[PDB]
Structure 1
Amino acid sequence: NNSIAIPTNFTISVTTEILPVSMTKTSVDCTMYICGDSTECSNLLLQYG
């Protein structure tokens, strides 16, 4: 009911916090992946919208 605890010294503490901010920005060559660089396959691919 009537007792309190009070610091008498202190401590400076440095902690770290690692955060991800950005990730690798890729791009894809939709045809060259799907259809292979050099193919009338690509000519079929454009059918797919």
Structure 2
Amino acid sequence: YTMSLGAENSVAYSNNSIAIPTNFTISVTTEILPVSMTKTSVDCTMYICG
């Protein structure tokens, strides 16, 4: 299929109307970030020649 970007949401804009929140949600989200790699050492003489 041809992918859809997102659901369409036409915001009801007018020159004298505002939307004010009456409530709130305390939302906890996860962010995973790599920090380090495996520290690998290669003996060049032993690798090439044994």
TM-score normalised according to structure 2 size = 0.69
> Which structure dedicates a bigger proportion of its chain to helix?
1
Where structure 2 has 5 or more consecutive residues not aligned to the other structure, the ranges are: 1-14
Provide the alpha-carbon RMSD of the alignment: 0.5
Equivalent residue number for residue 33 of structure 1: 47
Identity %: 100
Where structure 1 has 5 or more consecutive residues not aligned to the other structure, the ranges are: 37-49
Structure exhibiting the larger radius of gyration computed from Cα positions: 1
Runs ≥4 residues deviating over 6 A: none
